[PDB]
Design a protein around this nucleic acid. Structure first.
Lengths: 206, 123
RNA sequence: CCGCAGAAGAAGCACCGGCUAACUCCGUGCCAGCAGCCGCGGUAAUACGGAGGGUGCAAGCGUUAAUCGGAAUUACUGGGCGUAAAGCGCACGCAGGCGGUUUGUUAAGUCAGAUGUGAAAUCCCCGGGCUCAACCUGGGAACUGCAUCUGAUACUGGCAAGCUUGAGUCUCGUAGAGGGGGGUAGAAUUCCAGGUGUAGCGGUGAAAUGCGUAGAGAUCUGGAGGAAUACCGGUGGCGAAGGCGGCCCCCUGGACGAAGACUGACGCUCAGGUGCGAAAGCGUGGGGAGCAAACAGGAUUAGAUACCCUGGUAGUCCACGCCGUAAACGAUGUCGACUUGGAGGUUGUGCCCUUGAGGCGUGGCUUCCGGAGCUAACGCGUUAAGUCGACCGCCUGGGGAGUACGGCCGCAAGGUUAAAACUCAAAUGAAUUGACGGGGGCCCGCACAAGCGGUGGAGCAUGUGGUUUAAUUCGAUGCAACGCGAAGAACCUUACCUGGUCUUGACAUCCACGGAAGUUUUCAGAGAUGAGAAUGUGCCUUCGGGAACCGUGAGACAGGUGCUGCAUGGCUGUCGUCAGCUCGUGUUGUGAAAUGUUGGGUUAAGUCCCGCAACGAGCGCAACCCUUAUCCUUUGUUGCCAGCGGUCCGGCCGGGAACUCAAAGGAGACUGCCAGUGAUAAACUGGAGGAAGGUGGGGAUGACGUCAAGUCAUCAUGGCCCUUACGACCAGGGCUACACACGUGCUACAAUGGCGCAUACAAAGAGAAGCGACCUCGCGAGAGCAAGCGGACCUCAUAAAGUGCGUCGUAGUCCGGAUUGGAGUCUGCAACUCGACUCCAUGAAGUCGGAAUCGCUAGUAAUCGUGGAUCAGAAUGCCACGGUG
RNA sequence: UUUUUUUUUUUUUUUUUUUU
RNA sequence: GCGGAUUUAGCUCAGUUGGGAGAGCGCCAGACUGAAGAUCUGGAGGUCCUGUGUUCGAUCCACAGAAUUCGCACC
RNA sequence: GCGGAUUUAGCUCAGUUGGGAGAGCGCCAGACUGAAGAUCUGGAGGUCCUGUGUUCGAUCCACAGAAUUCGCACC
C-alpha cells in the first residue's frame, strides 16, 4: 500500500546520483532548465540499447555527460561521427561545452533499470506479451539478484480495459538504506493507453 | 440474516416476486374487448393507452394491456392474450399480440421483422 | 446420361449480455419496454430502442402452450428418520406381522431344462437394391410370464419327531417419600376477655390512605377458629409418565434374591379402540388460614390503564367424570447376538484364622467414556449412528393449515381426518460478526473531586437566518465547519452589477515580406483606447546575414481550482509512545478462528520463571535528535571588567585575564553508596553526592493499524469537463442594513480600587520594497533637521505591578467613551450615504443578573506586557515565550 | 438465583467492471 | 321578543372593590442531550367586542349598538 | 343512407353552441439539505384534437377531416 523509494533518500550509500553539480545564489535557473532538455535528447538517441544511468556532472557549468548504455559501439558510431553530433546538440541548449563520456551497462540482466526496458519493449509486438514478461524477469534473475517484485499498471487488454497486476519472483525488504536494492520504472503504450512497469530489485543484503 | 425480514428483497435484481393469480384452464387465450377504459389517476401518467376489461370466466373480474403500437383497439374486437405484467400496470395480469381482425397494430415500422411479422423494405 | 451457352438462376433470421455464441457507435430518461431462472433501464442503459458490422448456422433461425431435464424424489426393482419432512406423554388386548432350529421326509413357490405362445414392421445387430443418403428391406435374434412335463434340492411353507425352555402358577423371602378409603403429631400469628408502657408502630429510589387523653404495636394469662409437612431427609429415594414428602390400619400395586416342582412358544410387538390424561373451561355443594393475578387505592406521574405497601380472592387441593394435551427429545422402537475393555457411583450377595481401611469374587441398578473401523469442524470412538433384521406407524417442497364445507365422538365450546381452492421462489441449523454498549470486571482522563478565574441581564465589534428590498453570490449548519477561502467583497488576485472590446484573443512559436530602438506633450476619452505636434537613428559590418528590437501578412494555433478521494502517489491528521501486525515455511481449522492471549505462578507494566507444535524474517524495536543545564579546553568578541593606572568623574582610556556573556569542539549522573522495604526477586521512598533524578526537563519523530476523514483553492497525475465557453482586456460601484438574536470577542458596576505628585529592576522580537536617535515647531494625532545602524554599537519599553508623600470620604464620578457638539489629519482617483484616529466640550446601560456552555491541576486558566506578517493597507482574529502569582 | 438513572432519533445513498 | 351567557394569552379557561392582567398547557431562552421532549430556572404570550356614562380608575358596572348563543313564547 | 355525445395543462377530467378557460396529481425550481423530506416558499403548464370561411372577435359556429364510441339503415 506504499510505493517507497529505496533510491534518492540515500545518495552516498551504494546508490550514486543522476546529477552532481554546483550553482550559487543567482546562477541555478538555466542549469536546472537544461537538465531536463539534454536528458530528453540523450534518451531518444540511446533507446536502441537504452540508458541505465544518465549522469550529468558540470565541472564549470559546461557538462561532463556520463552515459551508461548496453551498446556504446552505436553512439560512438562507425568511430567518432555521432560523438561529434551529441557534443554539439547537448552543448547548444546549455550555451557551454558538453564532454560526452560513455560507459557500458555491465550485463543488462543485473542492472538498476534495464529489467524494466526489456519488459516494456514487448508491448510494441502488440500480441500477448504475458508469454514473455514473467520469463524475461526470471531469465535476468538467473544472471544476478536474490529477490525482485514487479508491478504493471496500464491498458493491457482491449476496448475499455484498464487494470493492474503484481508479481514476486523473490522476497523484498522494502526500503532498507543499507541494502543493494534498486527501485525504478519504464513506460510503454499499445494504441489504447499507457503500460507503465515498476520494479523493486532486491539484489543483495548489504 | 433474520430470514423473515431478509427473504423479502435481499440482493437479486430481477427480484422473482410477480403475483399471477387465477387459472381455470390455460394462459394463452382469446379475449373479447367487453368495455373500454382510460380512467384512473396514477403516478405513471399513462397517455392514450386505452386499458380495457375482458369477460374471462375465472372466478373474479380481470383486465388486459394493449400489448403493442397502433391506436385503434376498439371495444367490439377479440385478440390474443399472454403473460408479461410490467411494473407500470396495477390490476392487469396480461398483455396482447394485437394485429388480428381490423386492429392492425404495427404501421410501416420496417424494424419490427420477426418480433411482429413484417415484410422487407428497399434493400 | 451426352454436346452447347452463362456463375450463370439458388438465403436468410435470432441478433449481438453472460448460458452454446461475435461488440460496440448511440438513444430515450425505472420513457417505451422484452420479463425465463438470471439479468437489464433508477441522463454515461454492451442484448430496452436505433444503427454499423458480422455471427451462430444455412431451408433453415429463434421461441412458444405444456413437464420430467441438470437434480438424486413415492423407492417389491431405487430411501432418507440431529435437519427440509423426520419413532406421534400412553398400551388394557381383538385381529394381524416375526414366530425358538434341525433330523427323517416333501418339492407347491426356488432354479435349470425339454416343448408350446409372441404369423409380419420391433427395440438390438448385419447383408444388401436403387447413383444413393435416406428409403426399400431381407436375414440373425431376444421376450421374465403362462402352458405341459423332466429333474436338481440351498432357502419359502409344510409333515413326523422332538428341545433350546421363550411363558406362568406354586414354594420361600425382603424394603422405601404407597394406587383408594381410613386414624392424625407440631412453630408462628390473627383477634378477643382482661393483665399494662405511653405516645408512636407499619412501608420506601423518598415514603404513604387508615391510626395516636375513646392509649402505635407488642408481651402474659383465658379462649374461639382455619389444619402446610418444617425433619434420622440426604453430599438422596423411588416411579409407566406424572407425582406424594411425618407414620398407620385395611384392599396389599409392582416386584424379584432364591433350594426347586410342574407344563413344553401358552411368545414378542401393535393400528382402529381400552385405560390414563400437566395447563384450562363445565361443574354441583362447598371445605372458606398465611401469600398473592384480578379486586381496591394511597403513591412515583411526560399518559402508570403500574410494579410497590398494609388490606385482596383465585391458585393450595378434589368426592366424582366428557378431559387429547402443547416443551412427557439418546432432537431416537422393537431387540437378540455383541465378550479388547478397563474406571467409578451404588445395591444385593458366594467365599476368607472376617488379625482389615474389604481381600478373591460377581449379577442387577447406573454411569464413566476404549481400538479396528466408521472419518469434514469441533470429535463421536461396540453395544452409540459400523454390520443384521419383525414393522403398528409418521415422511408429498414454498405459501395455502392446523384449516373447513360429510359426520365419527363430545354436555355445549371442540376433538380429529390434515383433505383442498390454488399459487410461486427457498431459508430453518452451523459457526463467524461485534452495534459503541450507566454489563460483571480491570481500569483511566477537569470523566469527576476538592476548588480557582469567569461567560452571562442592560450597552458594545460583527458573518447567516429572517425583514422584503429595486434586486440579491456559491458553498458554512454535531464528534470530520466557527472569525469564512478574504491576512483588507469602496483601483485591489472580481465575485458580481454592468457597460465598453474580443472570440487564435492577454501571453507564446515556425516563414513571408519588411522595419533601426525610443524620448517629450497638447487636445480628446470613464478605463480599454482616439486625433496631432516635435525631437531621435546605436553593435558585428564579408555591405552579405542579422543582433538589441519594432512590424504588418501567411498555415499550423492559445486556455480554466470543474470536483470525483472510488487508477493512483506524495503529504496531514487523533487515534499512539499500545511495544504493532501478519507472514517466508509448517499445519491442527474446508474457510471468515489469529494459530504464540493456551498451563502453573510471578509485575503497575506481553513484568519474567517456564511451558506450550514453534519458529524467526525486518521494515516499528535497540535510538541517532534539538535546546538545555553544569562546565571542560582554546577564547577573548562591539563584548567587557577580578586587581591597579590616571580621573577633567562618563569603562571615561590606561591595564590584565577570575566569570557572566559569545561558542565552537564537545563533556560528565551511575542504584553510584547509605538506611528502611520484600523473595538480599521486585522495584519503591528518603538520601550520600547534585545543575536534572529514576523518559531529569522542554522540542522531536508520529511505523502497519489512521474516518471508506482529507490537501479535490500551488498538490502530483490516470478515467472524464466548457469551449460563443468555466477563455482575457478595463472606469464605475454595493456588500456592512434593520425588527430578530446568540453566541464568539469586548467591558462598565470603585478602596485587595484607583486618582495626584514623586520613586526601585527585565526583555522576549521584527528591521535598505528597510529601521532611524539627538534635535527644531507643538494642544497633539502630526510636521521637519538628521547622527547613524546591518546584525549585543542605530532605534521602537521609560512592562504593568510594587514603593513614599498628598487628595476624595462609598460619592453615579473623580472613574463609565455608549456616544455626540464642534475642530483636525496620514494616504488616495480612491473612506461618503464606508473607514482608521486626534483636541476640547460632554455622558447611554450603569450598583454585583438567574437559570445552567466548559475554561483550568502547576510552574498551569485569574494577574502582568512587548512583537509579526498578508499588503500601495486599520483585523479585536491568532500565533509564540517571559513573570508578581 | 432482586435487577424500570427518562422514552424516542426519516428514507435514501456509500458500496473502484470482469472470465481465472 | 323577553331574559340570560358571551366577543379575557396557540389550547382549555380562570379573573373582576372598579388602579396588577392570571394560571395547567404551548412556544423560547438558560442547559442536561450530538438533538429534542419530560422535569427544570428565567423571560414572554391579550382585537379585555364596540360606543357612552358613572367614576380616582371600567376587563368588570349601567346604558345604547353589533355579533354569536341558550331556554321559553309559537300549537 | 343516420347523425348525436366525450376528447381540455405532461394524466385525469369540472364545465363551455362566440369574447377563447379550470383543479388536483405529476414536473421543474429559491433554500434548509451531500440530495429530499420536518419547518419554509416559488414557477407554470393551453389560444379546450385541428383546418378553410365566418366574425370587430373562435375550442364553440357553418363546414370538413382525427381519436374514444353508440345503436339502428347494413343481410
Amino acid at each position: 500500500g506504499q510505493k517507497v523509494h529505496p533510491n534518492g533518500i540515500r545518495l552516498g550509500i551504494v546508490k550514486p546520483w543522476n546529477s552532481t553539480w554546483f550553482a550559487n545564489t543567482k546562477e541555478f535557473a538555466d542549469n536546472l532548465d537544461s537538465d531536463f532538455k539534454v536528458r530528453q535528447y540523450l534518451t531518444k538517441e540511446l533507446a536502441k540499447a537504452s540508458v541505465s544511468r544518465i549522469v550529468i556532472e558540470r565541472p564549470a557549468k559546461s557538462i561532463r555527460v556520463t552515459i551508461h548504455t548496453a551498446r556504446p559501439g552505436i553512439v560512438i558510431g562507425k568511430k567518432g561521427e555521432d560523438v561529434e553530433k551529441l557534443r554539439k546538440v547537448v552543448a547548444d541548449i546549455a550555451g557551454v561545452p558538453a564532454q560526452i563520456n560513455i560507459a557500458e551497462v555491465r550485463k543488462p540482466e543485473l542492472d538498476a533499470k534495464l529489467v524494466a526496458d526489456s519488459i516494456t519493449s514487448q508491448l510494441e509486438r502488440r500480441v500477448m506479451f504475458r508469454r514473455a514478461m514473467k520469463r524475461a524477469v526470471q531469465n535476468a534473475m538467473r544472471l544476478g539478484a536474490k529477490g525482485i517484485k514487479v508491478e504493471v499498471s496500464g491498458r493491457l487488454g482491449g476496448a475499455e480495459i484498464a487494470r493492474t497486476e503484481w508479481y514476486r519472483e523473490g522476497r523484498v525488504p522494502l526500503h532498507t538504506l543499507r541494502a543493494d536494492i534498486d527501485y525504478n520504472t519504464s513506460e510503454a503504450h499499445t494504441t489504447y493507453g499507457v503500460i507503465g512497469v515498476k520494479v523493486w530489485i532486491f539484489k543483495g543484503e548489504i | 440474516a433474520t430470514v423473515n425480514q431478509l427473504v423479502r428483497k435481499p440482493r437479486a435484481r430481477k427480484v422473482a416476486k410477480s403475483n399471477v393469480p387465477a387459472l381455470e384452464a390455460c394462459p394463452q387465450k382469446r379475449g373479447v374487448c367487453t368495455r373500454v377504459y382510460t380512467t384512473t389517476p396514477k403516478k405513471p401518467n399513462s397517455a392514450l393507452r386505452k386499458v380495457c376489461r375482458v369477460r374471462l370466466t375465472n372466478g373474479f373480474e380481470v383486465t388486459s394491456y394493449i400489448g403493442g403500437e397502433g391506436h385503434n383497439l376498439q371495444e367490439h374486437s377479440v385478440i390474443l392474450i399472454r403473460g408479461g405484467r410490467v411494473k407500470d400496470l396495477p390490476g392487469v395480469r396480461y398483455h396482447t399480440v394485437r394485429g388480428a381482425l381490423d386492429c392492425s397494430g404495427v404501421k410501416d415500422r420496417k424494424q419490427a421483422r420477426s418480433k411482429y411479422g413484417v415484410k422487407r423494405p428497399k434493400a
